[PDB]
């Protein structure tokens, strides 16, 4: 129990006619958001979205706000530069995304590094696993690949990833031990939903679990009902917790022939529940 990752997600977007570009930044440690910046607010500053982070002085907040305030300035250029690079007018709304961060083992040491960009939902550039080379997605990203090779950016980044990213991740993990390094199992149950005179919907619930990683499945007489199960995207409840249901369409009376199988890192052993009338 110690595979943890700090993750920053940036989102810059132009608004021609109606507005300056917007910068929105969020920060995660695992599935738990802890920060938020928005350049579109009353004197933008980065703000806590977790409890263990409000313990940090205005030193953090000031440093972290300015970082974003400069990253904002940076992403306003990135929008105007990508205009040149893509031979595009000051007319369309275009979009930068960025994900940087670091996975870390249970020993607390660097395990993986991340940095990657995307113009309009297409991958644009991505620092590789070695934290020393790049991966441009088109000839326009190659302009940037050689800018940055000629600038030793892959060094500046590895430093942050191997140094500051990993050190602060361990800070965060420690300051919020119970909140971050804790996996709460789901509250599971089966409901019955007669869709006919004839057949019915058995739905299997998983409520209030953390983290988001879960594996619900339906099994009729001990076999994979994979093609015949309705699965919804794991969703947030609005309270650090998540949900997810699996649902299958069965006959009537044949209901105990089905079983729901829950796997979650909060559970000692996997679950197996059927419908209890």
């Amino acid at each position: 129990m110690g595979s943890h990752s700090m993750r920053y997600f940036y989102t810059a977007m132009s608004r021609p006619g109606r507005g300056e570009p917007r910068f929105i930044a969020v920060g995660y440690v695992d599935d738990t958001q802890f920060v938020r910046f928005d350049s579109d607010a009353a004197s933008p500053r980065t703000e806590p979205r977790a409890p263990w982070i409000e313990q940090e002085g205005p030193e953090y907040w000031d440093r972290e706000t300015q970082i974003s305030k400069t990253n904002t300035q940076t992403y306003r250029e990135n929008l105007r530069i990508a205009l040149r690079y893509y031979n595009q007018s000051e007319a369309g709304s275009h979009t930068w995304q960025t994900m940087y961060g670091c996975d870390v083992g249970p020993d607390g040491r660097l395990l993986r590094g991340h940095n990657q960009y995307a113009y309009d939902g297409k991958d644009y550039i991505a620092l590789n696993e070695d934290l020393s080379s790049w991966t441009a997605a088109d000839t326009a990203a190659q302009i940037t690949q050689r800018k940055w090779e000629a600038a030793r950016e892959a060094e500046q980044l590895r430093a942050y990833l191997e140094g500051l990213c990993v050190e602060w991740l361990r800070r965060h993990l420690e300051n919020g031990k119970e909140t971050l390094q804790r996996a709460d199992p789901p509250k599971t149950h089966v409901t019955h939903h007669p869709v006919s005179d004839h057949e019915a919907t058995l739905r299997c619930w998983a409520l209030g679990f953390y983290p988001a990683e879960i594996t619900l499945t339906w099994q009729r007489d001990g076999e994979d009902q994979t093609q015949d199960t309705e699965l919804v995207e794991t969703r947030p409840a609005g309270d650090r917790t998540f949900q997810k249901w699996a649902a299958v369409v069965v006959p009537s009376g044949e209901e105990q022939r089905y079983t729901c199988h829950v796997q979650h890192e909060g559970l000692p052993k996997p679950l197996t529940l059927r419908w209890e009338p």
Partner: peptide
């Protein structure tokens, strides 16, 4: 923590 990041 955030990061200051390059141009393009």
């Amino acid at each position: 923590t955030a990061f200051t990041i390059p141009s393009i």
